[PDB]
Amino acid sequence: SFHFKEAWKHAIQKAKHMPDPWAEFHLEDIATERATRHRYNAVTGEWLDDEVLIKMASQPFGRGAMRECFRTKKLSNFLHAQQWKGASNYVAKRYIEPVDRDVYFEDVRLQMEAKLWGEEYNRHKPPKQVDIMQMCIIELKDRPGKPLFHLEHYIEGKYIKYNSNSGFVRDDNIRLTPQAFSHFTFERSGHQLIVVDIQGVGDLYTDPQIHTETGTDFGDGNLGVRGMALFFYSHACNRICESMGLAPFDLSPRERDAVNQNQSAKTILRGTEEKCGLPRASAVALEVQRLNALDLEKKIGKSILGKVHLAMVRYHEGGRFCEKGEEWDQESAVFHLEHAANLGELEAIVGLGLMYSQLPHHILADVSLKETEENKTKGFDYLLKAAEAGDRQSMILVARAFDSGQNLSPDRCQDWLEALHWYNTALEMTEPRYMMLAREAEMLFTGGYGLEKDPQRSGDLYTQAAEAAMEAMKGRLANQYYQKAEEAWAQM
């Protein structure tokens, strides 16, 4: 029934000959202490507390930027001696600067959620499986302060950071598994989160970071969709990503070349790999299909992928992807802004509309595009999309385009019926109201571009404009508007 027993026994006996890697630190001579261990169950969302006995070194053997590390022995093996002498070695970690107690508990919550995601990755039969180390909290009740410590089992072997939570990816012999794992978590969660900051020994990972759509849980390391943007800027899809059916993120040409520029006999497939899938593809075309299939009430802002592309735009403009002696990549910035707008981010639609129309714009303020008929057409089409999606500024701009021709698409002509429609739509929203009402009244008085004269409606609109001017405390203007209303009614 078990044709592999002997491999297990080989390993058990070799571990038996193996010495304790911490033998010379003689932790067994330390005075035993009592602590309360808090362990988190991420399926049930429940904490379990119990008592444990530990021997902890008095001095730390290492510290990062945030935490100090202490060698610790968790005491089991009271009745029978440690067969493998290293099975009770643990690392305890304490924050260097004081933190609120719940930061420890949220760090545990993070690590265990990432562990669940590793198990989900393994369920798709990857060529190399992964595992996120379990981590818990120990509280030293007897010590002053009731100090909290993170606790993980010690793992001997070379420690490697495969990627960071800020875009770093190993600039040498890359491994396919950590990167494919991160990408898999982006797709399988439906773009709601990504697990990055992959690091540890082999594929035994520890201290991961999760970026979520909201950005609020999992501590200060949650950079939200900015973190997903940082990941996908540097991510190169490999054979594992493909074998699981992950769609590549749409990178610009320059970004594509930089990613291909960054060798070894890396990890090899086996043929059992299953397709990922809630799950969402990472490519803009498939996401456009998803939004089209969804019964939209002319709805926009429903794409997380578009927000990731927008965060990319803002990182470009901010110099995050620039080396110290270069000019920041405007071309790729506009590429990602286009992708964000086609995925329904209203800020991107308005920004591209203003930019292609040669109008002033906030996003990518210092970027200027060529004045062409194609670009003028694109700018007006974007501004029309923004107006149809509720943006008042674009509404007013489109009205003035159909009115006077300013910033109108060269594919289109002046049209005062359309202009009146857009003026009215903007007016119904809770650039002054009386000015737009008076412009309407003037168009009705005059007529033209498909709009026949209407003296009575013109007088009524001049009257409404005068009343709105009174509401604005512009009495003299209200008198002028009343004069115009009587002037229009006298045309009859």
Binding site: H10, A11, W84
Partner: protein, 145 residues
């Protein structure tokens, strides 16, 4: 059968739970002591020991009685002290399950000559559940066959 080093370790533990220093612990403190030793007594076994050591109805458990209970626990170990400790060389994080990645880490640490497919096959053979991991029950069953 108990060594003086084991006895000194138990003395440290007992002193840690004999906080008021009367030389005894109460009968409800004993459960917590035993669970803090990394041992997992069933509530039946626990209640048995409780009523036995407190036959005189005094509530007190001194250190010699605790040591006697530990000696009886050492001989009544369900003769599986080897399999319990052999499980722990593979369950690296100590979460009660051996994962394929953990087994791979061990087989590479200890210089064993298996491929990653052979490691996946050890796991899938021992993993009767089919949940992708090997629990302690499955490890025991694989060992005893």
């Amino acid at each position: 059968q108990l060594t003086e080093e084991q006895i000194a370790e138990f003395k440290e533990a007992f002193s840690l739970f004999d906080k008021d220093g009367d030389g005894t612990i109460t009968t409800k403190e004993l459960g917590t002591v035993m669970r803090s030793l990394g041992q997992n007594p069933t509530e039946a076994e626990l209640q048995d020991m409780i009523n036995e050591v407190d036959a005189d109805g005094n509530g007190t458990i001194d250190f010699p009685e605790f040591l006697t209970m530990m000696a009886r626990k050492m001989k009544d170990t369900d003769s599986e002290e080897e399999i319990r400790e052999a499980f722990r060389v593979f369950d690296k994080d100590g979460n009660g399950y051996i994962s394929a990645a953990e087994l791979r880490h061990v087989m590479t640490n200890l210089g064993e000559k298996l491929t990653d497919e052979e490691v996946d096959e050890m796991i899938r053979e021992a993993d009767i559940d089919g949940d992708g991991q090997v629990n302690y029950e499955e490890f025991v069953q694989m060992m005893t066959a």
